[PDB]
Amino acid sequence: AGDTLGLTRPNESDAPKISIGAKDTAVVQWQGDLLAIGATENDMARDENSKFKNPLLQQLDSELNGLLSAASSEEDFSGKSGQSVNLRFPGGRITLVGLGSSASSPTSYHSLGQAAAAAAKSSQARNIAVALASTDGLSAESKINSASAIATGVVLGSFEDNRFRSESKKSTLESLDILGLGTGPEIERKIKYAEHVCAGVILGRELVNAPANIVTPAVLAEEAKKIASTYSDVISVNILDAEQCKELKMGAYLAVAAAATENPPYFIHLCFKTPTKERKTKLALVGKGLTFDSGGYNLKVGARSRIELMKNDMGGAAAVLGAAKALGEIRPSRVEVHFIVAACENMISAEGMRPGDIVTASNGKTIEVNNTDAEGRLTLADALIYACNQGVEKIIDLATLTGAIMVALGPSVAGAFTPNDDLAREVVEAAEASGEKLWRMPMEESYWESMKSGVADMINTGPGNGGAITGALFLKQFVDEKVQWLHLDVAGPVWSDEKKNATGYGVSTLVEWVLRN
Amino acid sequence: AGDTLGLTRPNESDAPKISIGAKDTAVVQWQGDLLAIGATENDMARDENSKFKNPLLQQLDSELNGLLSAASSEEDFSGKSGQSVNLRFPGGRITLVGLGSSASSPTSYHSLGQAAAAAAKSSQARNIAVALASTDGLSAESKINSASAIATGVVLGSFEDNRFRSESKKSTLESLDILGLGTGPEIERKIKYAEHVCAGVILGRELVNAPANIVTPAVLAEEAKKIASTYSDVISVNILDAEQCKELKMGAYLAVAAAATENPPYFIHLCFKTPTKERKTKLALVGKGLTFDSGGYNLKVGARSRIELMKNDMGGAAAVLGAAKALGEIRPSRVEVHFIVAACENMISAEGMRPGDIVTASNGKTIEVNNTDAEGRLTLADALIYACNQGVEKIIDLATLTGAIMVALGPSVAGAFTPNDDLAREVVEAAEASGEKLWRMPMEESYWESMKSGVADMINTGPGNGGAITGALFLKQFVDEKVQWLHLDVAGPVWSDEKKNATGYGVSTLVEWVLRN
Amino acid sequence: AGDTLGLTRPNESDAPKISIGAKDTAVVQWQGDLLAIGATENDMARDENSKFKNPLLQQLDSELNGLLSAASSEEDFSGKSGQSVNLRFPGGRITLVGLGSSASSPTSYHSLGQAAAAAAKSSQARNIAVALASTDGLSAESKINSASAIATGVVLGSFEDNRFRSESKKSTLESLDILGLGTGPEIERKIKYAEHVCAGVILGRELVNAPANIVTPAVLAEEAKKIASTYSDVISVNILDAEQCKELKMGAYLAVAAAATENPPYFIHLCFKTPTKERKTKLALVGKGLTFDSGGYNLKVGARSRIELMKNDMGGAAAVLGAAKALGEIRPSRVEVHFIVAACENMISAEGMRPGDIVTASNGKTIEVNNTDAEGRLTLADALIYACNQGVEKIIDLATLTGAIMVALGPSVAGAFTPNDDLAREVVEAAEASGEKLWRMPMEESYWESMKSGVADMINTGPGNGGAITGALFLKQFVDEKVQWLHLDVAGPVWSDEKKNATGYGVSTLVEWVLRN
Ligand SMILES: [Cl-]
Ligand SMILES: [Cl-]
Ligand SMILES: [Cl-]
Ligand SMILES: [Cl-]
Ligand SMILES: [Cl-]
Ligand SMILES: [Cl-]
Ligand SMILES: [Cl-]
Numbered sequence A, B, C: 001a002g003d004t005l006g007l008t009r010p011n012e013s014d015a016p017k018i019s020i021g022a023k024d025t026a027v028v029q030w031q032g033d034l035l036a037i038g039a040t041e042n043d044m045a046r047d048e049n050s051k052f053k054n055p056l057l058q059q060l061d062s063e064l065n066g067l068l069s070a071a072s073s074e075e076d077f078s079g080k081s082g083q084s085v086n087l088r089f090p091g092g093r094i095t096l097v098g099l100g101s102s103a104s105s106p107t108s109y110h111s112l113g114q115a116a117a118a119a120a121k122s123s124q125a126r127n128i129a130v131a132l133a134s135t136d137g138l139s140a141e142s143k144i145n146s147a148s149a150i151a152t153g154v155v156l157g158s159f160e161d162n163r164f165r166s167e168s169k170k171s172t173l174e175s176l177d178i179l180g181l182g183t184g185p186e187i188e189r190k191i192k193y194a195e196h197v198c199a200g201v202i203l204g205r206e207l208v209n210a211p212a213n214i215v216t217p218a219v220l221a222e223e224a225k226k227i228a229s230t231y232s233d234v235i236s237v238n239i240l241d242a243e244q245c246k247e248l249k250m251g252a253y254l255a256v257a258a259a260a261t262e263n264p265p266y267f268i269h270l271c272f273k274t275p276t277k278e279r280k281t282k283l284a285l286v287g288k289g290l291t292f293d294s295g296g297y298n299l300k301v302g303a304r305s306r307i308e309l310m311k312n313d314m315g316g317a318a319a320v321l322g323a324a325k326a327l328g329e330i331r332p333s334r335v336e337v338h339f340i341v342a343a344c345e346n347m348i349s350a351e352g353m354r355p356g357d358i359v360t361a362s363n364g365k366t367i368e369v370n371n372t373d374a375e376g377r378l379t380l381a382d383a384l385i386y387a388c389n390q391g392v393e394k395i396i397d398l399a400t401l402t403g404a405i406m407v408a409l410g411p412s413v414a415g416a417f418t419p420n421d422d423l424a425r426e427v428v429e430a431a432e433a434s435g436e437k438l439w440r441m442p443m444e445e446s447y448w449e450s451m452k453s454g455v456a457d458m459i460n461t462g463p464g465n466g467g468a469i470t471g472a473l474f475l476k477q478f479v480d481e482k483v484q485w486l487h488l489d490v491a492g493p494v495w496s497d498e499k500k501n502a503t504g505y506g507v508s509t510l511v512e513w514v515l516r517n
């Protein structure tokens, strides 16, 4: 492809194509290529004869003349978290997946689904089923929630992104039956819901996986246009170029973008709402959209600069867009959702911002840019101002903002910062439902003193100690106090080092939060 | 002093000696060297004539023929946080201290007291008074709490540690009258209580300020002996030497101590309880007591190693001892409090632990010491085991454990880690009452995977990302699960960079927590 | 254990205890817990019907009614290197292990054995068998060599060192039958030989795994004494203390050892020979025996200093001792083998060598120690002189000498340096037979110019560029030119980062080299 740096052309998308149903079929009767059973440590208990006490495992073992309990014992499988046994026999394949002794909802069922997907891929299975060894004392509603979390683990666990690999094998998984957790309209509705969330998660992973010569600011804006065109009855789009953002006086955003003359910036505005008449709560989801971040003149240097992973500095924007993709299918009433991303890349050239430059955001405040590698908060300053100007009641921003948050919270837990206690409670509860990991961090106001400039209204970059907190405090200067606002620093969990791949972190939590408004 | 490295002899202690009373005297009638008035922004409102509307300021200004409102206006004092006006006139001196627009209890009143102390010191005042410009709509109980917080700010703000300075001036402040907040037994009882807490805070600051050639492990154990001897009806002491700790199989502690052959280690055990018969809840306060930390063979190197401040690595122990000093005066019933510090210094010699050495804690678990600069958690392993073995129901440990927590939370906010939600609530509430800043951080269990060893039961040092969390998870391996336990990483707030001095952080929170049991 | 730093006591040794035989039993007839089959890509070819063409796999699949070829296809096993299929069925367990398309002897058969051991451990197997899918066109001698290499992979792959873990599971593997490769005296003799080499490899791994608070110079000398006592008819021992090494004028060795006053140095001399009368070629094996290396005053600092792995700086000594252990069982005629290790630890204290100190080796040459972290070559200087003084014809030294060699050759390939072309050929051929990876590097003489001192005969540490080569050139100053000598820099392969464990690298190559003299 001749306009792309390095002539790289992506292959066709690998988004999963799986037909999912909830069935009542007795597990012993089910037919297909693979049955995955989620078993807790208690589920694995054995009697005086070393036989399974769990009625389902007892029955399956009995059909296999003891082969299942023999193999489990030899392999020391006792239902612990992370354990699995895989048995191929005449007629099919069974895998037991350990759930541990404190099975948490929905993450345990996500992991059951992921394990079922990994075992499907390693035997090239096409049609699989998943059941729990026990559903005793789970309510009808808990079983429905466990069903849709299993479906999520299977769909997302099946996804392998092979767009940039010259040779690879397509996924073979075609269907999933979820057994023993309920049938009929309500469970099917909840599974459908999970599938819509998964399509947004997968779009998120694809946008972040793709390198920055493929996903440029223009391409990110085209991706937002494609979402609006797909759901054009409920989502509209406005893309602003650099000239329009200049008329809107977005000096902090345009200053970050100034160096990157080859891949011009675009400011993305999507708006979801159903065309009905009821009152709508107005919400904004703002995502940091640095399609690449070199650091600018404050170039990222050192052996763990991670400069080579900075295509993932649009990870917040990928979550906002994935949330739009999910909500276009789900079509909730009662909400109007603005999805806003100031997309650009942070490069080095003769046109670029210098360290020490003073830039003026669209609310008139001046910022001394003492480090050009703290550029995401400058693009967010203008995005947050624009979001407030659309008349929204509540805003969540997601940004890969600081290394400091990963020091604080490790790679897997995002830090949530907000002046507004009710909004914190809403987001914590949304994350409890989605299974995603986040943690409220304090907006310690006394650290604002370190952000003073000798020349402008403020600097952009505080000391390393407390760096995620002064990031949050900086963003607060650009948010109208009448709007509830929470900032989620997702530098860690947007990317998995162990998988070397994007996670699509944030999409499911944002969708839950919208639906709970 | 001939046995001290560098021949250094401390001067006499500068602990404040202030007589404090609560009085009803009309502020305009009060006589002495300095009156400090706490004023909020609202308290500073002026009428059509530019005169104060607040009845107290109106009256004082009227006696000064307008000099007070003239000076306030010229100096642009309007009651904002951090502002003050100082006026000397025939008959006395007044200072107005800004309290801002959201005066929080008790920190605002701490700051009022601190400001009154700073203004006393700069005019060599001996007898001062503090009042609020307004007490409207404060309950009798809130006024008592504001009185004792003012007394705290004055006492602690007056303290200047001049033990190691060859020439310096003694503090001149002799008395404080707190006006308009109530009189009689209940307010006097609460002020007395604050004074007891202050004596513990000040002992804490002195222990941490003193350099490591003065406060050695032996000297720290002598300081604990002096507390027990002072309060010998309610506090007993047992000091264990290296040989006794070896009989108790404290291999992780003794390994850290092994290099420091010149200043041998001592394990400090104090126990507070009143000699009465009621049931006592059994609690332990465990403090990290590294009287110096070079890093050992993993020497602290680099321009911000802070090696030159590592006398403050016994900051957790200083809080535990200060809490003992306070509780010996307060004598609460219903509690038995164990104060435990495994004191040592972490040095380099031929006898020292090498990186990669495997050490065995007293519960039998083996630790591969992949970094000898993560030595505090090894001494704490054995201290926590000992605390559990005394039969306590709840434990709090305080330790200057990680640089990672200061990255997360800045210099002023400690991170609290606990498996036990009720204990977290107790400590959060204790800190709300004490005014100290702390914040719960999560014990993310998935990070325990990074702590695996190829040879021992675990390593001592995880990756930088999530380092405060894996510190917490490591300590958890040494705590009996039946005991509620919370770990407070106080690396930041035990030391003030701006003041170049110790804070005695932790003492007041621990005392509140004990009294709320 | 009260004299050990950290009170650590090793558990009982986990050296494998496996009974190994070579059998003619048809593979389909064999009975036990696990059969492992080594299959090349060609061995996996299928016919028009998708059935195995290989007669053995065809037969096994036919007994399993197609279950083996079904499972292989689903799992995409086609005999590639690193692939395996594991099938549990009524009556037993089979694993197919991919050997690839260019199966090299003996490493391929090592890997087959290792894979069989890993599959034994994961099903707790006690009695296993290994066969090749095809032995067509392998000579009787190649099949014997493949048998003993399989036995090696099984024995070494089974070994798990749990001496320092407080809870762990003992290995269950008890017996190995090697099928279809021959029976009778010659194959049994070759398997026995491999077992003797394995016992030396395992002693090597144990000595290196053990941390430096457990394996001190004294303990290493006791380990050498135990070897001599075990084989006292053919191996004698002389251990020299610091005072005796001083009489021998070993100033470079004693200078390195000077700081470590707590763990004194011992110079280990073993001598193997059978008590018969024929002429013996006299050989020496010299191993660098730094039981720990801090760097000394040139302390190892930086995030990848690897200071925490420096217990493995006695990896060369571990190979020399393991070779002694093997040769004590093998008892070759015609050779007299001196095994020499100048054991010490490189610490920091008031007694230690300073950078810039001039030390005098026992041949009278003076060395300016411009970096105390290049200390291994100073201990080797005196060890090499002593080896020459015993009248040997050829010397090999093994040392973990330089980071530079790992830069050059990666973690898995040792660099061999020698003035003597015939000795290089001997060692290359010995390594071809043992399967170990090494590569001749040049002794570029022009770089000796960088080793000049302004004050002594030479410095010890050249520039980083060419650092492994100037290491070799330095050692050459201490070797009599009449003695053939080769230096093997094994800094990389003595330790596996992926396994977090010692490899015992060097033992099998040294044993082959001795037997080929
Ligand atoms: Cl079948
Ligand atoms: Cl694309
Ligand atoms: Cl509004
Ligand atoms: Cl006067
Ligand atoms: Cl003192
Ligand atoms: Cl208890
Ligand atoms: Cl069987």
Ligand SMILES: [Cl-]
Binding pocket: C010, C210, C214, C219
């Ligand atoms: Cl040993």
Ligand SMILES: [Cl-]
Binding pocket: C391, C392, C393, C482
């Ligand atoms: Cl000779």
Ligand SMILES: [Mg+2]
Binding pocket: A293, A295, A372, A373, A374, A375, A376
């Ligand atoms: Mg940046």
Ligand SMILES: [Mg+2]
Binding pocket: A290, A293, A313, A373, A375, A376, A400
């Ligand atoms: Mg960025």
Ligand SMILES: [Mg+2]
Binding pocket: B293, B295, B372, B373, B374, B375, B376
């Ligand atoms: Mg330390």
Ligand SMILES: [Mg+2]
Binding pocket: B290, B293, B313, B373, B375, B376, B400
């Ligand atoms: Mg420390």
Ligand SMILES: [Mg+2]
Binding pocket: C293, C295, C372, C373, C374, C375, C376
């Ligand atoms: Mg060295």
Ligand SMILES: [Mg+2]
Binding pocket: C290, C293, C313, C373, C375, C376, C400
């Ligand atoms: Mg060395």
